[PDB]
Amino acid sequence: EXCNXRAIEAALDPNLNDQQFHAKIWXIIXDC
Amino acid sequence: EXCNXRAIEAALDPNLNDQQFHAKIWXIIXDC
Amino acid sequence: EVVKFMDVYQRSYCHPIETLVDIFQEYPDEIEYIFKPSCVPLMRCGGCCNDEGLECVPTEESNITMQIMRIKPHQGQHIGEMSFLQHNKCECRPK
Amino acid sequence: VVKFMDVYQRSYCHPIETLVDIFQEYPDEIEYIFKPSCVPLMRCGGCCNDEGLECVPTEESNITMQIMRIKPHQGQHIGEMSFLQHNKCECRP
């Protein structure tokens, strides 16, 4: 759904890197 | 293990062929 | 706890199975962008026809659609949908 | 349309059923023929989504199956075989 929201906005962050973004989304998968 | 019985016995038949043997196990795969 | 011959045969016999395929293999062309994930789950033909003169081919097939990140390095990254081919049926047929 | 989140989660590196050729797992005897010629095995699959990372099995076990070993014109017997399975997979340098 707000979960898939979070996972997309995570993924669009240019200023991140693969492993940081990896962590960020696998919080939204850890939770949602 | 009856079903698997028939399935092993069929497979041990030397006088059969690939496609006939195939049919025979699949007669028991017709049941179980 | 040893798996019985009949179950091994049935489970490994020719059939559509989930298969993780690299997106670059479904799209060998282009390759300007980069894909996250680099691989996607797709139903494909797997198994054995248990015959010498038979190979396993898809008879019926459909189209699945997934949200993937297409990324041009230093040029930016956008999200979109892509369509992949999946296999709904497989059979053992001659060649 | 499958959501990015589900695609990401479901395609991320992990053990998956994989149909492997028995001849690939036992190249040493091409003499016999196996029925079935291929077998289901849990193996490493997916992607680590990094350039400098590969997916390797961490935990590994052993599975045993009834298979037909067949010597053409020399006879055919049924028996047990042991294959390697992957119980866990990790993304590592």
Side-chain angles (χ1 to χ4, degrees), chain A residues 1-5 7-23 25-27 29-30 32, chain B residues 1-8 10-23 25-28 30 32, chain C residues 2-9 11-17 19-25 27-28 30 33-35 37-51 53-69 72-73 76-84 86-94, chain D residues 1-2 4-9 11-16 18-23 25-27 29-30 32-50 52-59 61-72 75-87 89-93:
Chain A
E1 307 71 13
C3 301
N4 186 38
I8 295 182
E9 70 182 3
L12 295 172
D13 195 328
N15 298 286
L16 290 185
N17 66 78
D18 278 334
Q19 197 56 29
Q20 189 178 11
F21 147 71
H22 178 210
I25 196 168
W26 248 104
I29 297 181
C32 172
Chain B
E1 176 157 342
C3 303
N4 189 41
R6 285 201 287 272
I8 299 181
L12 291 171
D13 193 328
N15 297 123
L16 290 183
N17 67 76
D18 278 334
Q19 191 51 229
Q20 191 181 15
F21 145 71
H22 183 211
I25 58 207
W26 249 107
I28 330 295
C32 299
Chain C
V2 37
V3 296
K4 299 169 319 297
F5 171 78
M6 51 169 319
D7 300 343
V8 168
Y9 192 91
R11 298 199 67 250
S12 56
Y13 185 79
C14 168
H15 69 302
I17 191 168
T19 299
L20 302 162
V21 196
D22 263 17
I23 310 184
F24 300 86
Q25 268 44 81
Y27 303 95
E30 193 259 332
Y33 295 94
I34 234 53
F35 300 110
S38 202
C39 49
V40 279
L42 290 177
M43 297 283 202
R44 293 301 182 88
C45 282
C48 38
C49 296
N50 283 321
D51 285 42
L54 298 191
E55 69 176 2
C56 182
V57 295
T59 61
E60 77 193 358
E61 63 203 11
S62 72
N63 192 266
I64 198 176
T65 309
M66 312 196 177
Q67 285 170 337
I68 310 295
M69 283 280 315
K72 203 174 301 180
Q77 51 185 247
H78 68 94
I79 189 181
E81 57 189 348
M82 293 193 306
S83 291
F84 305 94
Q86 281 189 331
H87 297 174
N88 297 84
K89 262 188 156 279
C90 299
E91 295 167 26
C92 292
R93 290 148 82 101
Chain D
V1 171
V2 184
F4 169 80
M5 148 176 63
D6 299 339
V7 174
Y8 191 82
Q9 170 176 10
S11 156
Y12 185 77
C13 170
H14 71 296
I16 51 173
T18 309
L19 302 160
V20 196
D21 263 19
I22 301 184
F23 298 86
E25 298 298 318
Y26 302 91
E29 54 277 338
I30 321 186
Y32 294 97
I33 298 99
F34 298 81
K35 207 70 70 186
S37 58
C38 51
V39 132
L41 290 176
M42 297 279 205
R43 293 298 183 87
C44 282
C47 37
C48 294
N49 288 325
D50 279 36
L53 297 188
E54 68 178 1
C55 177
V56 291
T58 272
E59 314 176 338
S61 65
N62 196 267
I63 200 175
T64 311
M65 313 197 175
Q66 282 168 338
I67 310 295
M68 281 273 312
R69 322 164 155 275
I70 292 159
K71 204 172 173 310
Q76 51 187 51
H77 338 263
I78 184 180
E80 272 138 28
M81 291 193 83
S82 288
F83 306 97
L84 304 193
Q85 282 186 145
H86 303 175
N87 295 80
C89 298
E90 305 287 57
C91 293
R92 290 155 171 198

